[model samples]
Target: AYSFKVVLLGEGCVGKTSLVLRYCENKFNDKHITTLGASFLTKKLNIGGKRVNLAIWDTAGQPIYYRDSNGAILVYDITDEDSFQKVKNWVKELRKMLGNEICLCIVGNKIDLEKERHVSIQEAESYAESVGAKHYHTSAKQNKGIEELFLDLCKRMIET
Candidate 1:
């Protein structure tokens, strides 16, 4: 089995915790208490023939201990353009801390609320490409594109 540590970083209430919870527990709540600092959970997945163990942390604490984390999921709310910009800032800080070698994914969450969307997929994709990152859209409430995003990240980390 290959064990990997993945960190989710974003501004407050951007669905970082929601994605983690939805993936780990296969559950979602309309209301999520804000994660003040950092919290984590583990989930095991079989990627192809390989057993992959994911240690997912929802804050910046992991960089201090697990600086060699396999990958990171940079999350933003689709309805919030400022949150998308924050994703870029977080990416910069992460690169400074973990170096430019780490695998990163830019996630635009809350696609179920597409009516309120402010960030366009094209713009986000372009930005992700410029930064050498992959872009994903997800809706935790509706469970859309959640699994594929994590699987792609896992495949990415393994590839790198």
Candidate 2:
């Protein structure tokens, strides 16, 4: 089986937890990084007839979890402009520290509230294009795009 570490990055209230939902095959909690919290969700998939598992981590400013992560979901609240800016800084840090060794996905979450969106789709996709990252829009409440995001990220990492 191929195991991979996944990470979710975004500002507070960006709905990181919702993206993962509560339907994980396994969700374990830990005391590491007490400033926030730690609970990596487990997911197993058989894609291309290959066994695959992902331990997804939702975090805020904890680089300890970021080390050696195979894929990262750079999340941003569609209605919050500043949230996108934070993800941009996170990209710099990740690129400088992890380089292109990791696969990246720029996700604009909370699309269910598109009426309040501050970040335009083209604007975000353009930025993602420049940074060689794939773009996705998600509505965690409605559970749209979450599957595609994780599955696509898995394939990209698996190819590595």
Candidate 3:
């Protein structure tokens, strides 16, 4: 099995923890760890016949986590424009720190709260396209979109 590391980034309360929670529970939960300054989870997936182990870390703003990371999930709550703007900031910072080689996945989270939407999909996808990052919409509450989100990212990570 091929193993890769991914980091989660975003403004607080964007439901990143929930996203990780949903995806981890859906995929794997037999082994887990929560010590130091971050929590780590392992999700093993099979893509076409090759097994893959994805190491996901909720390591915030720590320069240590960005190093050697295969990808990053930049998340933002759809109902909060400020969080979206913060995602842009992380895009700039990540590109500067890690350069374009690192895969970036800009996520529009909390789609279940669609009635109170603030950031339009058009604008967000446009921004994602401009940055060479894939955009995804994930609703942790109802369990949607994260499978493709992580799978697609693993594809990019494999290409590298």
Candidate 4:
């Protein structure tokens, strides 16, 4: 089995915990709560015939938790302009802490909340591309694009 470590970093209330929980457990709930220092999650995925182990580090979105991390997913709420704006800074921090070519994804959560959407998908995609990271929009409430995002990350890790 191949192993990888990924941390989720972003501003508070950006739905980092929710996305990690939904993607890891395929579960979601109405009750919301902020995450602590970090939570560990493991998933076993079959790639062709190989066993790929993804060790996901569901970390606090707050800045105090920053440390050494192998890879990172910079999350933001598309409906919240502040969260989106903070994405740039988060990505810069991750690049500094994790280094260049470390696997990364710029995830825009709450895409299902289109009525409140303030950031465009194309904007996120372009920014992610400019930074050499993949981009995805997920809705933990509806479990949309959650697994695909994880699987795609796994694929990229394996392929690279």
Tens-digit lDDT track of model 2 for 1-160: 7899989888876777767762352232322223277568788888889989999997753378789999999999999999998888888988888998899999998888989999978989999999878999888777778878888999999888
Q: Candidate 2 regions off by >4 Å?
A: 22-35
lDDT values, one for every candidate: 0.85, 0.82, 0.84, 0.80
Off by over 4 Å in 3: 27-36, 60-62
Reference-based TM-score, model 4: 0.90
Task: Give the CA lDDT, 0 to 100, for residue 63 in model 1.
Answer: 51
lDDT of 3: 0.84
Candidate 2: 10-residue stretch with minimal lDDT: 26-35
RMSD of 1: 2.2
Q: What overall lDDT, based on C-alpha atoms, would model 2 receive against the true structure?
A: 0.82
Which one wins on TM-score?
1
User: Which residue runs of candidate 4 sit more than 4 Å off their true CA positions?
Assistant: 63-68
**Full ranking by lDDT:** 1, 3, 2, 4
lDDT of 2 at 6: 89
At residue 12, candidate 3 shows an lDDT of 65
Per-residue CA lDDT of candidate 1, range 2-100, in tens?
Answer: 889888888776888888888888888888676767666888889889999998988731257337777988989999998898888877877788876
Q: What does the lDDT read for residue 151 in candidate 1?
A: 93
- Rank all candidate structures by their TM-score, best first, as comma-separated numbers: 1, 4, 2, 3
Model 3 lDDT tens row, 76-126: 999999889888888888898889888999999889899999998999999
- RMSD list, candidates in order: 2.2, 4.3, 4.1, 2.0
